Structure formats: structure tokens, C-alpha cells
From Swiss-Prot, chain A:
Signal peptide: none
Biological process (GO), any one: proteolysis
Listed SUPFAM superfamilies: LexA/Signal peptidase (SSF51306), Winged helix' DNA-binding domain (SSF46785)
Active site (UniProt): S107, A144
DNA-binding span(s): 21-41
Organism: Escherichia coli (strain K12)
Protein name listed in UniProt: LexA repressor
UniProtKB/Swiss-Prot annotation, chain D:
Name of the featured protein: Protein RecA
Name of the coding gene: recA
Domain of life: Bacteria
Record PANTHER family: MITOCHONDRIAL DNA REPAIR PROTEIN RECA HOMOLOG-RELATED, RECA
Matches recorded under InterPro entries: AAA+_ATPase, DNA_recomb/repair_RecA, DNA_recomb/repair_RecA_CS, P-loop_NTPase, RecA-like_C, RecA-like_N, RecA_ATP-bd, RecA_C_sf
Keywords for this protein: ATP-binding, Cytoplasm, DNA damage, DNA recombination, DNA repair, DNA-binding, Nucleotide-binding, SOS response, Stress response
Curated annotation (Swiss-Prot), chain F:
Gene behind the chain: recA
Coiled coil: none
Record organism: Escherichia coli (strain K12)
Oligomer status and interactors: Polymerizes non-specifically on ssDNA to form filaments; filament formation requires ATP or ATP-gamma-S. Interacts with and activates LexA leading to autocatalytic cleavage of LexA, which derepresses the SOS regulon and activates DNA repair. Interacts with the C-terminus of RecB, facilitating loading of RecA onto ssDNA at chi sites. Interaction is decreased by ATP.
Localization per record: Cytoplasm
Stated name of the protein: Protein RecA
Assigned protein family: Belongs to the RecA family.
Phenotype caused by lack of the gene: Triple mazE-mazF-recA mutant cells no longer undergo an apoptotic-like death upon DNA damage characterized by membrane depolarization.
Amino acid sequence: QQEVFDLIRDHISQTGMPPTRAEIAQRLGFRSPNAAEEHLKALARKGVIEIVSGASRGIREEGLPLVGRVAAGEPLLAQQHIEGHYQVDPSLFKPNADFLLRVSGMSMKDIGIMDGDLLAVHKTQDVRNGQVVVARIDDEVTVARLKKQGNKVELLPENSEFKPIVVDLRQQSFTIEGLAVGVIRNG
Amino acid sequence: GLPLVGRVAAGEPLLAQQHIEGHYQVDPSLFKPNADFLLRVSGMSMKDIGIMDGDLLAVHKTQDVRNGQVVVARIDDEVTVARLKKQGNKVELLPENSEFKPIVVDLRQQSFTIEGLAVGVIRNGDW
Amino acid sequence: LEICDALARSGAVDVIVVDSVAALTPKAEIEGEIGDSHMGLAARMMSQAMRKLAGNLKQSNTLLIFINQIRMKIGV
Amino acid sequence: DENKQKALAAALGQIEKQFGKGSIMRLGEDRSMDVETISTGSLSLDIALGAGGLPMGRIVEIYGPESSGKTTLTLQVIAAAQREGKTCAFIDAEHALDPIYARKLGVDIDNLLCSQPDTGEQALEICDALARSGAVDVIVVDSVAALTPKAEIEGEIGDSHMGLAARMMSQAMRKLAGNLKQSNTLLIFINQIRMKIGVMFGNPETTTGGNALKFYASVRLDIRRIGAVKEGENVVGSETRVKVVKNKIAAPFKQAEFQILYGEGINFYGELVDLGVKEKLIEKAGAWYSYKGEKIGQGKANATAWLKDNPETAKEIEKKVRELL
Amino acid sequence: ALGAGGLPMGRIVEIYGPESSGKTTLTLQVIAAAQREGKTCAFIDAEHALDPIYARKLGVDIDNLLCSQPDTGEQALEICDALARSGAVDVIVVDSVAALTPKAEIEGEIGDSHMGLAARMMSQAMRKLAGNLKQSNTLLIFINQIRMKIGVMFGNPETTTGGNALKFYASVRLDIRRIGAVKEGENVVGSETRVKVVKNKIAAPFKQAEFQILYGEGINFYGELVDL
Amino acid sequence: LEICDALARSGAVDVIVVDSVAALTPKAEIEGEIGDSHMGLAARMMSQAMRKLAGNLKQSNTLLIFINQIRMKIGVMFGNPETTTGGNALKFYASVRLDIRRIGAVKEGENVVGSETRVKVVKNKIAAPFKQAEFQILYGEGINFYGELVDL
Ligand SMILES: Nc1ncnc2c1ncn2[C@@H]1O[C@H](COP(=O)(O)OP(=O)(O)OP(O)(O)=S)[C@@H](O)[C@H]1O
Ligand SMILES: Nc1ncnc2c1ncn2[C@@H]1O[C@H](COP(=O)(O)OP(=O)(O)OP(O)(O)=S)[C@@H](O)[C@H]1O
Ligand SMILES: [Mg+2]
Ligand SMILES: [Mg+2]
């Protein structure tokens, strides 16, 4: 927790040494070193603390991670591979951004996303008709505007050269992967 | 963070204090030539290349320019974004849209001025 | 689960019943606070448990009955 | 230049002396590289695998969700192996195999070997021993999710034991592959599905027990249930699908479909109906099917019954389908 | 992408990545390309999984290719040493570093810990192979497999197999991934690829290349021509 | 090592660089098979070389620089597991010891143009130890002097 991290930050400066797990647990108000160990591990997994041989190696962030691709046209293979990061604020985008995707195709030209761009997605599964979403249809991803009714869902284009893609929920699997929130272009 | 330029009045540079919208910490190294500052636009005139109303266009400030580049400039001391084509003593700024028409104003009457290139685009508007 | 395995190894008990699986709380969740994230910990514990019990049950010839509850899947 | 050829021959001879005859040879002359296959028990899946079955001497992986049909598929494979004269072996690590049902599927249980290992180590050790024995032709492992390291069995519930099974699998494949290729033995692994926590993109499914097996495997098959099969108000079977998600023999990413009828197994003649329809040997007439003009029946079940009762026509259909596809 | 126009002669290379990504096809294409210029090539298949007919489809002269399927790591590396000192072979391939197995491990049981042996064997192999390869002007290519590193809190968790010597001694290192599918109607006929350069002693590193692989044919040359 | 000795004794070479102490191999290993055990042969050889070269180097005023490599100490409980090859002799005789480490990248858009490098002085006998240094290595240019000057 943030308070636990602060306790190490000032205790180490005040005394010159980090507090023991027993001391942290006692300050937390519970009779178990596990209380301190859980928070120390959580901070370490966050990348804020280092651990070696059961002891802290030190008390020593890269921005949105680019994860994979997405297709404006026909669906494209879904496979996560974190190839790199970009240093940009989550606060810029309307709901906070979670990761970036690379766009191929031209089926959303009118709204303003085109080939080779980066699209910021906000992770969620609650969405409604008329929004811009990301969907997986049998291990293949597409970005389009949603229109759900009955047992069939329509994924509409935003370019007059492309025609809508329709999937029947009784034959193919459909999971919504998030909600688009913006774009970054550097080409 | 990097400064943001909003509405611009005449007689002062783009980065004048009253033109500063705020600071948004965006790393300047992401773009091909280092981005210096950002500038809000009404991009109805550059749709076909993917620029829209309300989006932000990053600029690397420099007066040097060549043919075929997209440049931020001023004519009549008014800010505009458009591509540059040079005839010689005459130069024209051009659109990338289906309803707009060129700008070839006379330098002897009103001269063009460059402030920087356009390096990339960022947006956060409603979808 | 430790008690279950201890009685299975003994060879003297023919039927064991576990009242509910939704109540088998991990130790880390017991010593923590409400609101903490314990993502997927009981599932890992259950996998370990089945892996360790599958053989002792058949060797000792015992029947182990798990009762379970129902919850909802959001966003289906 | 002949000065090169003399050196080449000298080097080859010295290698052969140090390590024995047959250590090195031109790839067009080594007959042990040639691939050989045995039947999978369904015609559609044998078509899906280009070479016509599962390759001998290699490794194979099968996975799916629960009640998909893995065990019945592997028993049906064993059965067709034995009718040609081969010896088989089964390792039931989950402690759940049933002799009587395995007999009904067609396996000969008076000659099949079996074992119910106490730990995973001795499971893999028995597999290695059988492979070196040179006298067993097919082996199948019931679940890689039941292969416990010895430390887990002797430990307590809740101990970490992080990453041991992956090391076990890596060492196992690394040691086994050569023995399995020398003895010409086929080994099949069954695997269960789990779910990853924290994955933010893509399919969140995974298989248990490290990730060396997917490298060392030669064919990976995915089996899932897609529907029910009914005679009245009571179900009698299951619809199935199979995906060849990896292949080192022929082109991958094909599909097969068939029925599994309880007590019987895979329904062979339904595949003949479907493939005869595809290859225009069976004349479809709306709800009615006709072969060479005669109406064989209405509906798939009726047509299968007709075929069952008229052996010669089914025979010629099967041979022609084999010839074409 | 490589900068100098291809893989250098008389040096060591390492191609690695995830599974079904294209390592064997790429190496066989290199062998097939080299045989049109009159060189002699060899293949050490430690995984016991090569297929000759498919190697003929891509172009290899199967009748003039030396193939060896060794039993242990030591024998597999000694055959390479013999070929490198022969002075007649121009390309060698080792199917996988993971398949190489110290003899002491073949003898033991499946639970035995042979802690640290494979890396030491490899670090001896490089020390002995470096000089002979240069003296004879022979290209040697290693292929590898990917495993996860436990205990890494933050950052990249992937890692290759076999220790650390091969990184220091490798003149080039290629990373290969599959990124998409190639389709004709509803069928799948190939796979898209991306090859990244991660170490390079003959030009600048960190470049890329994308092409297609079509089953039953090699790499799609004319598509590369179109894109270029 | 005999070439090094001869150049030191010639009196007309002012810098000698050896490209890897790991790539030095005793003859016994050269003529043997892969898999044998020639424990301690390289370490003994390097110790002999060191105690033979120390005098000549100073007599002729030449600078000899060894490059080395990293390897992992196995089964270590506490401490640092990294190590250098070639035995312990070289650590004693060295007059300065340097560790160079890459810590970042230099980017222009989407193109990597160079590296950012840390450097440390882990042993020194001409002045105080444990000072750092930092700079950039740009391909085709090596160390970037003028960036360092702009910083300093
Ligand atoms: N002895 C049996 N008698 C009748 N039907 C059976 C019998 N055993 C299995 N079945 C059913 O026929 C289908 C066969 O699927 P299975 O062979 O059990 O595959 P499985 O998913 O690998 O088994 P597990 O170990 O429970 S996951 C299923 O519908 C079974 O319910
Ligand atoms: N005999 C074959 N016929 C058709 N396609 C094949 C054949 N062998 C391999 N392929 C396919 O070509 C693609 C690349 O195959 P490989 O080069 O063997 O991949 P690899 O990663 O080097 O080997 P592993 O064992 O998967 S790590 C894959 O999609 C294969 O399915
Ligand atoms: Mg089963
Ligand atoms: Mg391969």
C-alpha cells in the first residue's frame, strides 16, 4: 500500500535502515508478519521494491504499453505481445487509457483513425449501442461501432467503401475487449 | 510538461502567455524531429489526411521548409495549417480536403510566415 | 483439505463430506482486510488439493463429496 | 576439386569410426526419416491430417475442456492400432479409467497394459523404460495435470513449489525424444485448460504443465463439444469438432466433425454419408437422400441405417471417398 | 535489414523465438540458396523431427545434404568440430540448443538435478569452435527455444536456453515471430512474419523485416518486391 | 601471451589490447574432446603469465588491457552471483578495474540511434575508487564527446 511504502521511505531515512516485517505488521495493527509481507510483495510486483533471498534489495512507470494489433477491415488475429511502451499520460484520455493497439485497414476513415495509428483502449465489458468498441470473434479482433439487437450483432463501418460485418451469437463466440478513447499518430 | 497553444491573437507569437492553455507532459522524443509544443486546430480543412476539429497537432519549431511538407504558418497574422507548394517568387498553401481551395496571397501585399513543421497528431475528443 | 488428506491416508474412513467450497477461505485472505485483492488464489489452492488427493482417495477407496454454490457471470 | 573430396571422405570416415556406422549420411538415402502413420479412428480427422493419420516415432498433444471426448478418442485410436497386431499401453494418472466401457469402445483389455502411478516421476520413468524396451508401439498419458513432483506429495497444502512441473516436463522431453524415435513409438499427451490472470488482450486460455511440450510436439489437436444428439426426448450422443492447431507433417489449420454415440463410440457411417454428399456420390434430394437413383432414406440417421444394412454399397462409397480425398 | 546484405561467413549466429514461428523454414531456405552457388551444407537434427520430402519442396538438394541425428550434446558438438576442421563444409545447422543433452543426464533418472551442466558444456563448445570456424571460413547457425524466467518482478520475463556464452560469441542474433494469417477466401495458406535484429557486429542493430511464408513454397519473394 | 611478452620486451609498443580473456584456451583443451574436464588449467596459466609480465611491462613502459566476460556463480546463497573468467590472479595485479553497463537507448522517432552507458571504477590505485561516469555511444561515432562537454 502507499502508506506502507511511505513508512519505509521515512523510516529508512530517519533510522538509516528499513523496518523489519514484524515492525511493519505491528504498526499495521495485526499480529502477523504476513500483513507486512503481502504489502511488500505487492509493492515489489508494482516495480517499486526489489527482493533478494527473502530480504529487500532496495526501494528503487514507462507509460502505456503497446500490446497488439487490430483491424479496421476484416477481423485480424488476436495475440498479445508487449513489444514496447510509450510515455504519455493516462489522464489525457476521457476514461483512463489502459493500453495501445496498432490499426491496419481504412474502415474508420471518417471518424479519424487510419492505417498504422495507435489507438488507446480502456478496459471494460459494459458498453451499449452506438459506441466505438473492440470485439473478438473466434480469436480475431475488429474495431467498429456497435449495434446489438436480439441474437445478432452488427459491426458497422465508418467509410462508404466498406460494408457491415454481422455475426450470429449461436455460431461464433463474441467477447468485447474494451472501449476506444483516442488516437496517437507518429508516422 | 510541454506547453499547449490555444486561441491565438494577432501581433504576438504562438507561444505567448495568453495563448498558453496549460502544460501536458508528453515526451518530446516520440516524434521524428523533436516536438517543441502543441497547437489546437479546427482541422476541417485537412480531413483526407486524418486531421479533425478539436485535435492537437505537434510542431517542431523551425523556419526551414521544403516542398511537399505540412507546415504551420500565418497569413494576415492568422494561424493556419496547410501544405506548401512553391512556384518561385510565389508560394501557395494548399488544403487536403474536398471543398476547400488554395491560398496564393501576394507576399508584397501580405507575406507568408513559418513557425514549425507538423510532426504528429494527438486527440482526445468525443467519439 | 489437510484434514481431508489426513483421514484419506488413514484407510479407516469410508465417506468424507465438505459442507461448502465457497467457504474455504485461504489463509492470506483471513489475515488481510476487506477490500484487498486476492486474484485467483483459492482456485490455485483447489487445483493443488485435487492434484494431491486424487491418488490417496483411490488407494484408500474413499468417497469425497463437495457441495458448491451458485454465482452469476457478469457481462455474458 | 578432388583435394576437397578427399578431405570430405576422410572426415566422414573418421566420424563414422568414432561414433559408429550410420552416424552421418546423405538425407536422400536414410530410409528411417520416411514418415509412417496409423489411423485415428475417424475418416474426417485422417483427411484433416494430410498424411492420413498420426506419425510413428513422434509426440502428439490433445487438449480440450471437460467432457469433450479425449479419453474415448484415445481408446478408439488404441483399438484400431491393436487390430493390426500392435502392442499398446495406458497410464491412468487421474485414477479414473473404466475397463468395461473401454471394452465396449472396442479395446482388447486382456492384452492392454495399464498403470496408475503414485507420482509423476515414475510415470515418466515407466514411459522411458517402455520406449527403451522396444516392444510397445503406442503409449498414452491420461493427464499432465495429474503428474505431481515428489516434493508436492510430501509437502503441505499451500506450499509454493513454484515451477517444478515445468522443469520435469523439460527434462522429460529432452531425454525421451531420441528413445521414442529409435524404437518407433508413438506417445500421446492429454492436457486440461486453465485461465490466465492479468492478461489484458487475447484469448485468456492456457494449458497446464509448462510450455516445452508445445515445442516438442509434432501434432496438436483441440477437441470441443458443440451440440447434442437426440433420438427422442433423451440424448444419445454428442457433436464434436477437432482443430489441427499445429502440424509438422502436412498443412495446418483444418477442421473435422463427427458424432460420439454413447456405448458405441465414433459413428463411422455418418462420415460416409457426409463425404458421399460432398463428393457427389450420394444424391441429396431435399430431406431425402438417394444413391444411384434409389432413395436410401430421409434424414441422416435413416441414411446411416440404410448404409448399415447394405454393406456392399457402403464399401464402394468408402473406397471411392478414399480415392478422391 | 541486416545492413551488410546477409549473414557473414566464418561466424556464429542464433535464431530464436516462440513456436511455429518459422525457424526451420528460414534455415532450410538459407541452405537451399547456398546450394545454387555450389557450396556443401549439413544439418544436425537434435530434435529428431526433420521431414525430407518437405525439405525437397522448398528446394534443398536432399541427395547432397549431410544429415546427422545424434544421441547426446557432446557427440552433436564433436561432429560439428570434425566438419569445421574438414575444410569442405560451408554451412552447418543445429536444430535446437534445447535438445542437446549432457551424457550424464541421459543416464540418470527424470528427477535428478544436473545443476548447471549444459551451460558449461556450451561455454566449452564456443571456446573450441570460434577459431576453427574462422580458419576454415564456415558459417554455423544455432537455433534456440524460449523459456520464462521465474522471479522477475518487472520487465521482460522471456529468456533463451543454454546459458550466456552464445550471446557473447554470436555475431548476429535474429528474433522471429508470427503476426497474422494469409487467406484465400476462408482458407489459411500461410503466415505473416516479423524478423528483428537484436545483435549485430557488421552493421547497426534494431532493424526489421516482414514477409510471408506460404505452405509448400518458400518465402514470398514477389510480395517483398512489390512492397519495396 | 607469448606475443604479448615479445612485444613488451621489444620496447617499441605502447599499447597492447587482448580482446577476451575467455577466448584464451590451453592446448590440452584444444587437442581434447568436448566434454572432458581440464579444471584449473586456464587459471594456472594466467597466474604464470601475470607474474612473468609484471616486470617487463614496467621495464618497457607499456599498457596492457584485458577484456573479459560475465558468468554466474552457482548455488550462491547471499551476495552477488556475477563473476569474471580466468581465475583470481588478474584481480590482484590490475592497477585499475572498470565495469561498463548499458542502461538505456537513444531514439529519434521510431529509430534507435545509440546507447546510454553507465561506467564504474571498482578498483583503483592511482586515485580514489568508486567514481561513476556516464555518456552516449552513437553508431559510427563512438563516444559523444560534445554532449559530455555540454553537460560538464
Ligand atoms: N462409461 C460410460 N458410459 C456411457 N457414457 C460415458 C461413459 N463414459 C463417458 N461417457 C460419456 O460419453 C462422452 C465421452 O467423453 P469422455 O470420454 O469422458 O472425455 P473426457 O472429457 O476426456 O472425460 P473426463 O475425464 O470426465 S474430462 C461423454 O459424453 C461422457 O459423458
Ligand atoms: N510438412 C509441412 N507441410 C506444410 N506446412 C508445414 C510443414 N511443416 C511445417 N509447416 C508449416 O510452416 C510453418 C512454419 O513451420 P516451421 O518452420 O517448422 O516452424 P518452427 O518454429 O521453426 O518449428 P517448431 O517445432 O514449431 S518450434 C508452420 O506454420 C508449419 O505449420
Ligand atoms: Mg478423460
Ligand atoms: Mg523446427
